[PDB]
């Protein structure tokens, strides 16, 4: 019967503020992203989010991963346990595969794939396996028809991935493990 929601806001210099909303919006903490000169996109995952939401209060689960994505191209990746504890923490892993400005970060609903994508040049989706923080090497390939990826979703149950680009065509894959 009880949860508590927290709002995380990223300054474009990198300073994360975490207000909480239950009592009126009062700053729980603030910590700096290490590195991080120009930040666009923060996203959490691994639990319940605005991209895989809950369906009854018993199912709300706290998110395990945090990811922060910069407009150089880098994406720092923190663990929530340790970042919350230490309040100026070290990124667990720092990914640089893409070269243009990160414009989408989604976690998988069970939180094992991070798909980091860029609006800015063609074929810039990569899917990252977490916890080991290692990019999947065989899909997307050279011929994957992607185009300038503008939006991405992950399906709640069936394990589907749905990508949409500038031509206006969404394409849809199934991660067959699920």
């Amino acid at each position: 019967g009880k949860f508590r929601t927290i709002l995380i806001a990223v300054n474009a210099y990198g300073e994360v503020w975490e207000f909480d909303l239950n009592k009126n919006g009062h700053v729980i903490r603030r910590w700096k992203d290490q590195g991080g000169v120009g930040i666009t996109k923060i996203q959490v995952g691994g639990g319940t989010t605005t991209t895989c939401p809950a369906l009854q209060i018993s199912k709300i689960k706290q998110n395990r991963w945090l990811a922060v994505g910069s407009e150089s191209g880098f994406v720092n990746l923190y663990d929530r346990n340790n970042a919350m504890t230490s309040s100026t923490p070290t990124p667990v892993a720092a990914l640089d595969q893409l070269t243009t400005t990160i414009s989408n970060l989604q976690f998988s609903p069970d939180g094992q794939i991070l798909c980091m994508a860029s609006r800015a040049v063609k074929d810039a989706l990569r899917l990252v396996h977490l916890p080991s923080c290692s990019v999947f090497s065989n899909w997307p390939t050279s011929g994957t028809p992607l185009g300038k990826v503008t939006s991405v979703a992950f399906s709640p149950s069936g394990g589907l991935l749905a990508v949409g680009n500038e031509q206006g065509k969404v394409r849809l894959w199934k991660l067959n493990h699920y």
Partner: peptide, 14 residues
């Protein structure tokens, strides 16, 4: 099953 998935810790590959 989420307890499984959460629990297991990160690693280095070969």
């Amino acid at each position: 099953a989420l307890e499984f998935i959460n629990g297991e810790k990160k690693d280095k590959l070969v």
